[model samples]
Target: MIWEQHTVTLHRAPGFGFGIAISGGRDNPHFQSGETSIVISDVLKGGPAEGQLQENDRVAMVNGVSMDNVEHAFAVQQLRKSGKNAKITIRRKKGGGYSLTGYV
Candidate 1:
């Protein structure tokens, strides 16, 4: 089975509304690659991420920083440090070609 990766950039929270949260790790199959498993747990309403990102959206990057072969903690920290606007990559639940989204 092929799981494709997509990219999008999201602004940091507060200005973007609520902060993004992630869970799961190497022990989990989805996250085993340290690539496809880091999922977006929440997207607070009235936030920039809300319309742009959805719950369970797999995180691919932050501010153009790659998540490939990265640890969960590292991904989280990098995302926190991304500051202001961030370029994110993700694999949507439904498969499709790559797209440039709002705030990206």
Candidate 2:
């Protein structure tokens, strides 16, 4: 299945945090910030991002700007910068994995 904007929900966590609405599986794509992306170093079951993705995945884009942990100061910069579809690239669990993912 293709990942799209309408398929996901973005919610502002109380106390100024954020949460990802999960409604899919490994066969289903997920959502990211419409502005920025990040490199997931860790994930947990029944957590904010559970069943959505894995750790060690290098996200190449979010909203639109390419994800850079070092080059970019914060993830919010990438999301707020784009207005259209959020593009995400990820390296799965192995060698040189990359894919262009779409988001709402």
Candidate 3:
């Protein structure tokens, strides 16, 4: 299968930070299609974002902002500015580096 995009909506827990870690940036880069990515490094267990988020997922959009190839500073703050309810677009690649179907 090819890379698939998924949109997820969730809330930031009142006092638990968003319960996720971010990776990839201008200097620290993970390039795919020659573009910088805002990657999900971790989704802490027992946290608000645990079930809906996934490790290695690329953040493509957030709160109506396009995150593709954005700077680290810009990408990292989208969530914080989005208030409690956040809608994110994420792209996830398929396993095995080969595929025939689609769905993120």
Candidate 4:
């Protein structure tokens, strides 16, 4: 099992969100890294993160703030703080990235 760290930049309208659904945290350790981290569960279409982000990606940081081991609600607050262009740091499984699904 391999996880690759990544940084994604998302831009959206002033009122619209990044259009990403994040799960997991120290309290809800069901959908993220083994050590309790936020995970990108779903990326809704027509959002800034649609083409740049995807599901199952661990959210290590948001807008320079680290959400390494926070609660679910706290993580949610962090994302819902402001509708600014988000600078996200994530961890994803290696291989099958973007369009390069190199099948053997």
Q: lDDT scores for all predictions?
A: 0.64, 0.40, 0.76, 0.78
For TM-score, candidate 1 versus 3, the one ahead is: 3
* TM-scores for candidates 1 onward, in order: 0.66, 0.40, 0.78, 0.80
**Clash tally for model 2:** 6
Model 4 lDDT-worst window of ten? 29-38
Residue 47 Cα positional deviation in candidate 2, in Å, after optimal superposition: 3.0
Q: Tens digits of per-residue lDDT for model 1 on 54-92?
A: 677777667667666567787777777766777787767
Full-model lDDT, candidate 3: 0.76
Against the true structure, candidate 4 has what lDDT? 0.78
Rank by TM-score (best first):
4, 3, 1, 2
Candidate 4 Cα RMSD after full superposition onto the native fold (Å): 3.1
Backbone collision count in every prediction? 3, 6, 2, 0
Question: In model 3, what are the clashing residue pairs, if there are any?
Answer: 1-99, 1-100
- At residue 86, give the lDDT of candidate 2: 39
lDDT of 4 by residue, 1-104 (tens): 76788898887654447888888888886633455677788888777787788797888888888887888898888788856577888888887376465646
The better candidate by TM-score, 2 or 4, is 4
Residue-by-residue lDDT tens digits, candidate 2, 41-100: 554545534444455454555544444432333454554443434344554543223344
* Candidate 2 wrong stretches, greater than 4 Å: 1-38, 68-72, 79-87, 94-104
